Structures are given as C-alpha cells and as structure tokens.
C-alpha cells in the first residue's frame, strides 16, 4: 500500500512499474536476466512542445490485474494554455510490454467543431521526453545500439551499429527502428508515432522520413545509460490549406507503443539487435494485406490511354490466363494504369469513374472475380495530387493556389493538370468520399490501390507521415492493400514501391529501402527493397535476398515483349518470391556495413561461410533457408555467386543474369514451390512441385527434397504460353534427379502425371478466344476455317490470326441481348490488295459487313499491342480497328466471319474481336451498300477517335489526341486563363493538345472507317475550335500519307466561338481517299501569354465535333463529255513526261487508265460517265498544283522574285519538296535571296525544314556566307543548334568553311560551342583541321567564359 512500485507478471517475465508515473524500473525474465527501464525520477509529459514535470499529486495509479495497470495524469501549464488529463494503460503479455494512451481529456476545449473547424487549445502533440522504456548501460556486457533510418541510395546504408560506452552521448536521436542489447537481452521499441525526422537519403517526403524511436543517454551512477522512448504522437493536429483556411483534424489512432524483450532468439551464441528484431515482429505494425506479398510472383501494368481502350478489362483477363499457363498458376498482381475515365492521366481524381470504353464496372468486376481463380490480384492507379477540369471533383476548393492566388499548375499533355489542395482534400472529407465512390463499384473484389506521385510536394509543401498515414487508412479501410510510386515513400503502410520494383527508374540514389534492419524485419511483407541492378553498385550488386525486378508487356511505356517479361519472372522474381516465404533469423558478414559508415559493431562471424555474407530464414513450420555469398570482395567473380539451400539441400547456385540487362549469368535452380497461389497454404503432398531454370542451358543433377527421396521417377514439363508441354519421365536414383534444360526455358517437376490448368478463352467476350491465344488448336476447337486459302495463328509475342489466299474464319456469337444494338470491331492489318472483311450473319443472311483494301495508315498508339514498332510484317504495323454495327437477332443466332477475298499470296492480320453494346447509328447506306451519309458527334464512340485514326505527328506515342469531356465551367472558355472550349456539342469532342509546327498529318479517316467511292462526290462538314490562324489545316489525300501528295486548306482561328468548316471531295480511282487534320509549320499566336497560360490558353489546340460526311449529286455527264475531258487532260499533260517524276507520271497514267475503264465498259451508265469526268477534273486540279510547286522551286533557285510571290497566291505549296527533301527556302538560302526568304517565311515556310540529310536552310546559310539571311532566319525561329545527319550544327559548318562574322553571330544567338558531331569533333576542332586559327581562338575564349 505504501510501496511506490507494483509488479506485472507473465510466464516469460516480471516487470516492476512505478506508481507515480507510467515507468518501468526493470524486466526480469524467467532465467533471471534483467533489462532496465527508467532508473531515474523522470516524470516529463510534453504537450504542444511544452515540457511539464509531474508531481505526486498529478498521478493516480490502479493495478487492474497481474497483467495491467492504469494511470491518470494531470498535465497542466496555465501560461502555455494546457489543462489535460491523460489516461495511460500498461499491459504485459509473454515478453511484451505495451504502453497505450487510452484517453485524452482537454479541460480547455469542447472538441473539434463540426466540419473540422479549428479547435482552440487543441492537444496537437504528446510525448514522454526521455521515458527510457528500455535501456542498456556502458557497464553491461556487450552493450550496443542498432538503428535504422531511410535510404533510397544503393551506396549509403540506412543503418548504424555501435557500442554503448561512457562517451556515448545522444539526445532524442531519432530512428525509424532502434534496438538496444546488453547483459544477455535485446529489445526494440515500436511506436505508432507519425513523427518525421532524420533520414540518410530520400528523393521525396510522403512518409519516407517517419522516425518513431528517440534514443537519449543519461548518467546512472558510474555508467552511461542509453534509453529508448517513442517520438511524439499527433493527437488533434491543426493544419492550413493553400487558401490560408485552418482545420483541426482528429487522430489517425490513439498513441501506442511497445517493447518485446528477447534473449538469444536465433540460438547463435550472441545477443544483438537480430534477437530483438525477431521478438519485434510480435509487436510491430504489419502493413494491411502484407501476408499475400510472397504470392505476387507476376507484377505488371495493363495500360489504357487517350480514349483508345488498348486494354479492355476482358482482354486483361485473357492475358492473366496466358501468364497463368506460362508460370503454372503462380500468383499475379496487375496494376490497372488507366482503369478510369479516358485512361492514364485522364479524369483524376474521380476514383469511382471506371472507364466505360473498357467495359465499365461490370467488366472490371468480371475480370477481378474470374482472375482471382488464377491467383491474380488487381489494383488501380489513382492520383490525389493533380486533377483535370473534366473531373467532376474539379472545384475551386479542390484547386491548389500559390501565395499570389494563382493556380498551382501541373503537367499539360492531353489536358492541363492543376494541383489538388491536399490539406483541403483530407480535412473536408472529399478524398475519402471519392474512395467510397470506387468502393461502391468494386465491392470487395479489388486487391490494392496504387497511389501515384505522393511525396513529391504537388498537393502541398508537406505530404508528411501524418498525411500519408491518414491516406493509407482511408485506402486500407476499404479492404485495399497500399502500394505507391517512390522507393522511399510510405515506410509504415506500403507493400510495393514502383521505383523500387522497377529497377531501371531513377538511378542509384532513388531506389528502394537500403537497410539491413528494415529488410531483416520486413523482406517477406513488401516489394520495396533493392534488387540486382549492378550498374548502381552497393546494395544493387547481387543482393542475397534478390528483390523484385518488374517488367511489363501490356503497353506501359510501350512495353510489349511477352517473352522478355516471362524470362525476367524466372530470372529474378521466382527466387525472390520463394525467399519471401521465410522470415530472416540471422544475417552476418554484410559487406555494405563498415566502421567508416557508422557500423563498427555490425554482426560478424568468421566461422560462417568463410567470413562472407550469409542470411538464414525460417518459416513457422521450421523449414530453413540459407542464402550465401561466394566472396565479400566486389572484385572477385564469387561476389555475385549465390547458393540457396532448403533444409540443408542445395536448391539454387550461381550468378544471376544482371538485372540491368548487361550480362547473362549461369544460375540454375530447382526450387520447391510448396504453396498455393491464394493464401499461401501448403498444397497436398501429391500436388507439390519444383520449378527448374538453367540460365546457360545444359545438364545439372540435384537432390530432391526429403518427401521426394523415395520416388523412382518424376514428371517434367516445359512451360509455354500453352501450359505444360513435352512431358518427360525422368528417373530418380538415391533421391537425385538429372535434368536437361534449354537455356532460359522454364520447367515444372511433379511426382506423377499432372493435368492441364483449365482455360476457357475470352469469358464474357461473346466469342471464344478473341485474341488468338489458344495456339494452332484454336482454329480447330473454337474458330471454323473454310476455303482454299490458309488461316494460321502467327506471332511469337502477341499472337494474331494470319490469312493467305481465299479463306473464311467463323465463330458463333454467344450471350447477346436480343434486340440490343452492338458494335463489333476487330484490329486489322491488310498487306494484300484484295479485300479483308468482317461480317456478322444470322441464319445465312448478312446483318452487317465491312471491308478494307490494302492498309494505308501505320499504328502510332504506344500503349497498344500492335503499334508500328511491334513488327506485324516487314518492320511495320498498320493495325486499325474495323467496325460493323448490328442488332442482335431475336433467334439468338449470330456468327462473325473474318475473311480474305483475294486469291494472292499476301497476308491479312486480324486480332482482338470485340463485341460491345453500342448505340451509335450515324451511318446511312445507298442500295449498293456504298456510303450515303456518316455523322458523328463522338457521343457513342466504342473507343478512339473513329472515323479518324491517330497519325504520326509524334511517332509511336501516348498521343496528345483523345475524346475531350464536358465539365462546365472548368472545361469551357473563360475559366481562369482558358480561351478554348474542350467540347463543342454534347458531352464529347475530338481534342488535339499543343501539336503545332509539326509539318505533317495529325489524324485522318481510313477507307475501312469511311469509304469514298472512285468518282463519287462528298460534302464534308464539321464544327471546330482552333487556337490560332493557320496552325492546323484540312488535309485530303489518297493512299498512304505522303508529303506533297495532299491538298491542304488552312483553318482560321475559332478561339472560344465555334467555327464551321466544309469542303467537297471526289473519291480517288483506288477507293483509298481520306481526309484529316494536319499540323502546318505556322507558329501559334500566344497573345502575350506566358508560362502555363501558353498551354492552358488553347492557342495551340484543335477541337473538332459534329462531323458530317454525305454523298452529293454531281452534274450528270454523257460518255462524250467524259471522252472529251480525257482528250483535254491528255492535251495538257501528255507532253510533260520529262518534267515529271517516274512515279508522278505513273500516278497520272494510273488515274487516266482507270477513268477510261469507267467510260468504255460495256453497259456503262450516266453514273459511270459522271464518275469518269469527276475523276479527271480532280486529276486536273492535282497536276496543276504539282506544276506550280516545281515552278516555285525553279523560281527560288534562279531567283525570279516576282514569280515566287504570284505562284503562292495561285496555289503553290510554300513548303514544296524536291527529290532530296529540299524546300524553296533551302534554295533561297544557298543562293542568297533576302526578299524571297522573308516573303516565304511570312507565307508559312518551315524555317527548320530538314532535307533528306537533316540539313536546314540555316546550315546552308552558314556553310556558304550570307549574313542577311542568317539574321532573318534566326528572327523567324531557326534552331541555332540544329544537327544534320553527321551531327553538324550550323556553328560547325561556319567554322569549317571559314566565316568569322558567322561564328560570332551564331555564338551570340546561342550556338553551343561544345556541341560534338558524329566524329566527336566540336566546332573548335573543325577550325584546327582546316587552317582557321583565327576562328579557333574565338571559340576557345567562348568555351571558357
């Protein structure tokens, strides 16, 4: 009763606690070993930064039971506005002691006012300064401290390991993890503190700096004592948003902390942090759903972007089944980047808006439910730092503003991103409500959230551990596992970092957690470490535990290599995931830790693995894994040699292939995979299997695991995209097996015969095997082939249907809703002149059909599986979607047929048959099935910008062209600095963002989308908005786009008010006519706008809506008029054969021969004669414009100045190119024509026009000697550092030829004096080799200025 201490007891220990404060005196374990707590009278409580010392009258004590005691603390300071009652609970269980603040009463406050209003006198922070919950002393045997801080740098360890001596002097030294050891015992301190502090290396905030342990020294008699305390906790924190508005937000959780007292837990004869770390796992926080991390063998990204629907949800399900077959059903983790709105970096932050063009919530749920049966987990990429006007969440309160009241702008790509006010988004309840929108759609089907960019200070200048803890909680609360971008981010709750798992990003300073303490504790719970990437060195030179190496094949960054993806899983990820099924128990001889980098007391042993690195791991069933390094010397070949043993038996040996792709290795393995792909439980003894991989290929012998020792044979299968193949029966002798393996080819070994994994291709897709993933077999089992020709499944990467000759491939459609409208589109690449068709039939009769001739438009969709960098045939891909529209019949009998009509040897490629509900009905036909009219308001587009297809103005790219969406007033002209409307009519339009001065086609129609019949006339009209005069133009062409062979009509400015465009088109003789939008060489008028206003303004954009194409009546002609028009055309051009190209003459002869076929056919009608006449009239207007083009190149070479001005007014192209790609400006600079050049530049000449050799007019002006031209060109916008085909800049050419006045003008205008050509020479070196010492000294003084 009068004793000032009490005793709490477990079967493992007894603890003495003080009655006057929640303090521990000492811990005595059953074996009599003692660990101190706080031996001194320290009674400090910190509230809001103020230390208050408690007296006897301020604390009441109550012993609840032998395992619990409650304290009531009166914490008061009148001057500092503090009057609180803190209730503290101390509990014990086994070797653990917990200290929890169970109640905080504020006498100076009524609470947080509604809507997170400011709470006056709020208790914001709380801590117990120098509480010393556990402590060690310099007088104890082997007294030491081990701490961990965050390091994303592969060369800089995050740990510290040192002896606790009399000289040890620390005060609130903060660590993420801290362990003390001494006198046979070890202990770590766990706290849920959101404090941010000291770190070794991290490129971002976002919870990277969470340090929860405070170490402090004090004198305890003759010895120095190092004690561990929790870092401060946040309770009711007051925060400010970007508008200066203040809020008080409640605690993420009440304050909690604990210790777990360990002895020699790993039984190695030493007591250090590793023993304390094993015990620490019993009290530490565990990220939500981290128990599934070892199962996630196949990580990857499935991408969608810019309305294209490159990867609809039911195609992602098929790719899951493809990877399930190739890995024998190992678990997967698919990150849906672009799951929402129009795709990746569209619709942020509308989390609940699942992409309608991908199949919406219904298809996403089917994909997730069915995918889970194959062990596949799904998660979505979200953004809580940047938003777009189109997002319904976009509001003025959501907008982040700067100290001046302006928008805090983000990235402009498809649309202009605007930063989100992170503090408003949290304190208002907005973010949590958008996550709830998503929760309603996905239910409990979705596994994880991938939070992009969090920590890069885009949402606020803070994004601390308190904000990240609250962010992870609202995510975890919906049943979602937390994953994020940056390698160092979110130490507390993230189970994956993209910049840790994808080792190619960021470089050696910006990777995953480089800590032995952190990886020892949590390797099995996260893919947030450093894997093999030797060029980074240090932690990245063959880590013994491996580390996730992530690749992709579904469009992310153009990644499409399926074979490289599978090869990579087996090279690094199968062994990394195997190692994660065990927990580290011992880790000695770490070469990265030395006395120089603060780790003098790091855990060593010369009796283990020759004093070289070794790690021991164990599971809860006592299975032991030992991973050993061949040598600790990085100059030895054995540094990268690793052996893995499972229960004393070698299961892996050798050097892995460098994770950076730089060197193949020699590693082989025979890994026992004992777990299912769901919760990771042990599969039944007979279902147990081994994975075999041999890097170089060859024959290796292995000892099978114990439970296989009595088998007399095993079954070995080669794994392919079709599953288990080439079954071999291999004999077992003395429990050993010999395996012959091809290089980098996976095999799976079973005890007996194994069945194939059951795969029903394309579930929910209305057709079986829509993506041609079923091998050659699919053309017998699923699709029916008929005809004299040939049908085959071709392509080693993304398999396709390839047709040759006359053949039909058909399949019955299932699960259609009778009477509903459907669109059916299929990707087609036709290399034959004969038609390739898609047809839907019902009971023998055709409901819908469409055809394409030879494909004329290459595919430039980076995230798409068949873009022109993927080699469909001949190093190119012309894949474009071909549509048919039909109403599902009441009979329920519908069949799709893909066919090649012609009997020639050329190929037709088809892939991805997609049947989707669609309400589009804008196409009207004539009786002959030809086009009567096509209208499109873009309100019912199944995907992409149909009837247009994206062109090559940016190469294979995540094209800055997409379907723009309405969200007034934010998307309309007038909001902020925005001058253009995103949408013209309805909710959707086609938008081009900032593609000015490309001098090429932006997008175009193609014959399979809209077919223009030879000779027929069409009226084309549309509504548009264009940011400047003449930046974009209407282009009309025939066949594959070629510069010079298209008709251009510049479009006038329509900025904020919708313009109307209309023109006529006569179809070319080959049925391949098209129209589109072209980016000219004309500079936009930015109207004095600066910075982000240049992009957000709309000055460089182009919006198109309400497209209307209609066949019009042309004036009727007789056969006589048609024939007379032939004589008239032949009279104008037959003589000009010499004046024409050998291909221009063939195009003229082609048209003429074809028009004569119309006139002279037996039974020709007035329609044929009118078509023949209209074709010749179009041929006339073409040959006439081509003549004015070569007459302009003739008048710019010889310098007839007045001919040049009249020719451009008559129609001649200012950018006419000769056979060497030379424009009239290239001829007016090489010949010196000042007046010609200026008028040309005003007209719209490309100042940076490159010829066949990349030579610009500025290159020619500098290489000849015209200073008048140089000043004009530089004023117009000539690129002073433009490089030709040999890397030569104009400065290189001026110095090489001998032009002193030129080198000075170029240098003044910004010429890079240290620019290297292809032979490494700079402009200075070119002067020395030619005898221009006077030029050389001018460039030498410029280089060192």
């Amino acid at each position: 009763s009068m004793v000032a201490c009490e005793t709490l007891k477990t079967k493992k220990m007894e603890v003495q606690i003080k009655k006057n404060f929640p303090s521990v005196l000492q811990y005595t374990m059953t074996d009599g070993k003692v660990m101190y707590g706080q031996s001194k009278d320290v009674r400090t409580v910190e509230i809001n930064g103020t230390n208050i010392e408690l007296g006897d009258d301020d604390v009441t004590f109550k012993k609840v039971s032998d395992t619990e005691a409650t304290y009531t603390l009166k914490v008061k300071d009148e001057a500092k506005k503090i009057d609180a009652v803190i209730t503290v609970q101390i509990t014990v269980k086994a070797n653990q002691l917990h200290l929890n603040v169970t109640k905080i009463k504020n006498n100076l406050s009524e609470g947080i006012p509604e809507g997170n209003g400011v709470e006056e006198n709020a208790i914001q922070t709380l801590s117990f300064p120098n509480q010393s919950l556990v402590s060690v002393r310099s007088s104890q045997e082997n007294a030491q401290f081990t701490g961990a801080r965050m390091s994303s740098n592969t060369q800089k360890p995050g740990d510290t390991n040192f002896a606790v001596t009399e000289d040890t002097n620390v005060t609130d030294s903060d660590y993420t993890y801290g362990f003390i050891s001494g006198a046979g015992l070890s202990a770590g301190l766990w706290s849920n503190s959101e404090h941010d502090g000291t770190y070794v290396a991290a490129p971002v905030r976002g919870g990277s700096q969470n340090t929860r342990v405070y170490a402090t020294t004090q004198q305890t008699g003759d010895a120095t004592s190092l004690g561990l305390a929790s870092a401060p906790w946040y309770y009711h924190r007051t925060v400010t948003d970007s508008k200066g508005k203040k809020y008080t937000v409640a605690e993420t959780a009440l304050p909690q902390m604990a210790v777990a007292i360990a002895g020699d837990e790993n039984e190695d004869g030493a007591v250090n942090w590793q023993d304390g770390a094993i015990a620490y796992r019993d009290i530490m926080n565990n990220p939500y759903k981290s128990e599934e991390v070892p199962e996630l063998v196949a990580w990857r990204i499935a991408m969608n972007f810019g309305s294209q629907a490159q990867n609809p949800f039911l195609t992602t399900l098929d790719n899951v089944k493809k990877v399930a077959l190739n890995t024998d059903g190992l678990g997967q983790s698919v990150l849906l980047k672009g799951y929402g709105n129009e795709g990746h970096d569209s619709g942020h932050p509308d989390y609940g808006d699942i992409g309608q063009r991908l199949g919406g919530a219904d298809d996403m749920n089917t994909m997730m439910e069915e995918g889970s049966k194959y062990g596949a987990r799904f998660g979505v990429h979200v953004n809580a730092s940047e938003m777009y006007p189109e997002a319904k969440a976009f509001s003025e309160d959501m907008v982040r503003r700067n100290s001046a009241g302006g928008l805090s702008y983000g990235w402009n790509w498809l649309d202009q991103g605007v930063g989100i006010d992170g503090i408003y988004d949290l304190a208002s309840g907005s973010r949590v409500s958008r996550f709830a929108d998503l929760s309603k759609e996905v239910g409990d089907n979705m596994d994880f959230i991938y939070l992009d960019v969090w920590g890069n200070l885009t949402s606020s200048g803070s994004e601390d551990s308190w904000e990240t803890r609250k962010m992870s909680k609202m995510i975890n609360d919906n049943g979602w596992r937390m994953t994020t971008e940056w390698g160092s981010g979110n130490e507390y709750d993230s189970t994956f970092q993209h910049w840790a798992a994808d080792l190619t990003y960021g470089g050696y300073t910006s990777k995953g957690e480089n800590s032995e303490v952190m990886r020892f504790l949590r390797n099995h719970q996260k893919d947030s470490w450093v894997g093999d990437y030797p060029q980074y060195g240090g932690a990245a030179n063959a880590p013994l535990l491996g580390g996730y190496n992530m690749k992709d094949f579904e469009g992310w960054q153009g990644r499409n290599d399926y074979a490289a993806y599978i090869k990579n899983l087996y090279t690094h990820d199968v062994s990394t995931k195997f190692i994660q099924h065990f927990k580290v128990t011992r880790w000695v001889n770490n070469p990265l830790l030395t006395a120089d980098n603060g780790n003098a007391a790091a855990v060593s042993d010369p009796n283990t693995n020759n004093g070289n690195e070794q790690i021991t791991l164990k599971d809860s069933n006592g299975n032991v894994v030992v991973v050993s390094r061949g040598s600790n010397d990085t100059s030895s070949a054995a540094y990268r040699q690793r052996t893995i043993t499972f229960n004393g038996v070698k299961v892996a040996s050798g050097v892995v292939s460098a994770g950076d792709g730089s060197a193949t290795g020699d590693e082989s393995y025979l890994l026992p995979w004992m777990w299912d792909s769901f919760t990771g439980k042990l599969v039944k003894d007979s279902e147990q299997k081994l994975y075999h991989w041999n890097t170089k290929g060859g024959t290796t012998t292995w000892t099978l695991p114990d439970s296989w020792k009595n088998l007399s044979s095993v079954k070995v299968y080669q794994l392919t995209d079709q599953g288990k193949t080439n079954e071999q029966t291999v004999a077992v002798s003395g429990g050993k097996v010999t395996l012959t393996a091809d290089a980098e080819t996976p095999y799976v070994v079973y005890k007996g015969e194994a069945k194939q994994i059951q795969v029903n291709w394309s579930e929910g897709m209305h057709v079986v095997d829509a993506g041609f993933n079923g091998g050659s077999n699919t053309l017998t089992d699923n699709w029916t082939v008929s005809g004299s020709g040939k049908a085959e499944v071709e392509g080693d990467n993304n398999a396709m249907l390839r047709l040759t000759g006359k053949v039909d491939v058909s399949q019955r459609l299932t699960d259609l809703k009778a009477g509903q409208k459907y669109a059916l589109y299929v990707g087609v690449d036709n290399r034959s002149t004969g038609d390739a068709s898609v047809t839907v039939t019902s009971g023998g009769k055709v409901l819908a059909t469409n055809s394409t001739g030879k494909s004329i438009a290459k595919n430039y969709i980076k995230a798409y599986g068949h873009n022109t960098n993927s080699n469909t045939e001949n190093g190119s891909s012309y894949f474009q979607n071909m549509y048919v529209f039909f109403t599902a019949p009441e009979n329920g009998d519908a069949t799709v047929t893909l066919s090649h009509k012609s009997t020639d040897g050329a190929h037709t490629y088809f892939d991805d048959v997609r049947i989707v509900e669609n309400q589009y009905s804008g196409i009207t036909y004539e009786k002959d099935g030809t086009l009567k009219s096509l209208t499109n308001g873009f309100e019912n587009n199944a995907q992409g910008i149909w009837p247009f297809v994206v062109s090559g103005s940016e190469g294979v790219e995540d094209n800055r062209i997409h379907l723009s969406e309405l969200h007034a007033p934010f998307t309309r002209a007038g909001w902020d600095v925005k001058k253009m409307d995103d949408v013209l009519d309805g909710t959707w339009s086609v938008k081009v963002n900032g593609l000015t001065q490309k001098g090429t086609l932006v997008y175009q129609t193609i014959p399979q989308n809209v077919k223009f019949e030879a000779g027929a006339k069409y009226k084309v009209s549309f509504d548009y908005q264009s940011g400047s005069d003449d930046i974009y133009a209407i282009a009309v062409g025939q066949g594959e786009y070629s510069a010079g062979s298209v008709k251009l009509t510049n479009l006038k400015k329509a900025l904020g008010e919708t313009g109307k465009a209309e023109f006529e088109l006569t179809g070319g003789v080959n049925g391949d006519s098209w129209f589109g939008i072209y980016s000219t060489a004309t500079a936009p008028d930015l109207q004095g706008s600066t910075g982000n206003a240049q992009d957000f303004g709309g000055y460089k954009d182009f919006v198109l809506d309400n497209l209307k194409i209609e066949r019009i009546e042309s004036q009727t002609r007789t056969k006589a008029e048609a024939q007379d028009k032939v004589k008239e055309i032949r009279g104008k051009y037959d003589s000009k054969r010499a004046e024409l190209s050998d291909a221009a003459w063939q195009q003229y002869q082609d048209t003429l021969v074809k028009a004569r076929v119309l006139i002279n056919k037996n039974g020709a009608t007035a329609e044929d004669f009118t078509k023949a006449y209209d074709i010749l009239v179009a041929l006339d207007e073409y040959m006439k414009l081509k003549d004015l083009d070569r007459k302009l190149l003739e008048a710019a070479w010889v310098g007839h100045d007045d001919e040049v001005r009249i020719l451009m007014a008559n129609g001649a192209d200012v950018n006419a190119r000769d056979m060497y790609g030379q424009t009239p400006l290239h001829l007016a600079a090489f010949r010196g024509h000042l007046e010609i050049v200026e008028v040309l530049l005003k007209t719209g000449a490309d100042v940076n026009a490159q010829d066949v050799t990349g030579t610009t007019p500025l290159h020619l002006a500098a290489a000849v000697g015209h200073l008048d031209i140089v000043e004009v060109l530089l004023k117009a916008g000539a690129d002073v550092n433009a490089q030709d085909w040999h890397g030569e800049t104009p400065l290189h050419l001026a110095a090489h030829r001998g032009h002193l006045e030129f080198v000075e003008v170029l240098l003044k205008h910004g010429a890079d004096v240290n620019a290297q050509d292809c032979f490494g020479k700079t402009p200075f070196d070119l002067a020395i080799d030619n005898g221009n010492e006077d030029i050389a000294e001018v460039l030498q003084k410029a280089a060192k200025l």
Binding site: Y1220, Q1222, H1226, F1230, D1251, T1255, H1259, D1284, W1285, H1296
Partner: peptide
Amino acid sequence: PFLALLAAX
C-alpha cells in the same frame, strides 16, 4: 542539285 555535300567544300 543536292546541296548537302555542296555546303560541306
């Protein structure tokens, strides 16, 4: 003519 190599001596 092709001006690329004319420019170069």
